[PDB]
Amino acid sequence: SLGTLLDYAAGVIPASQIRAAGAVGAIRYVSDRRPGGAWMLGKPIQLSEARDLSGNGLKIVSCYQYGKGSTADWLGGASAGVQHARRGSELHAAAGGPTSAPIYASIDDNPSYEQYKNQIVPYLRSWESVIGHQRTGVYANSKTIDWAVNDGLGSYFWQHNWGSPKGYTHPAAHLHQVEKRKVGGVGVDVNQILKPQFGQWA
């Protein structure tokens, strides 16, 4: 297998515990904590953590998510896409992330086709206007990935299963969230690597 990556926001996991869990790297946040989100110790990834991961031969992938539910980043369409892309680009660079690496903008939702057309499309076009089509990643279910692919929005795709049919993997996905688990007392999700160039920093 190509391997697995762990994604997490609640803390910083030492490189030796990621290795012990069998993962080859981590998907990490290039976003701020929303007010009251004191538990989000893993937001954003910092310079010392990134050097620790790379120093221990682990892969790093950038992902962006500030809001959630009724504060989902994409609700504000184009203006939100510009503010959030600028912030993610800033934090990716601040943690020593290279411009060759993309940033997975999060659609941590199960949107309707209407919500996709009226809000996610301008949200994602704005991510492309800021960091470019070649650096725009999309974290979303199989339907959203399908709609984005048809509109030519995003170059990297990370499938989540909220709204994805059970057992279906979109052929455009680089990464697939599969799974309820803690690594060193930090809640994590496990992600299968499906394509060899999946947005790793190096």
Applying CB under 5 A, the residues found at the interface with Na ion are 76-77, 79
Residue 154: CA atoms inside 13 Å, Cβ hemisphere, count? 31
Helix (H) or strand (E) holding 151: helix 142-151
Our CB check for Na ion shows the closer of 48 and 118 to be 118
Q: Classify 115 as helix, strand or coil.
A: helix
CB of 30 to Na ion, least distance (A): 21
- Say how far apart CA 68 and CA 165 lie, in whole Å: 22
Our CB check for Na ion shows the closer of 77 and 184 to be 77
CB of 68 to Na ion, least distance (A): 18
Our CB check for Na ion shows the closer of 42 and 81 to be 81
Our CB check for Na ion shows the closer of 79 and 99 to be 79
CB of 76 to Na ion, least distance (A): 4
CB of 123 to Na ion, least distance (A): 9
Helix (H) or strand (E) holding 189: strand 186-193
Q: H helices within the chain, ranges in order? A: 15-20, 47-55, 77-94, 113-115, 121-131, 142-151
Tokens of 131: 């960091």
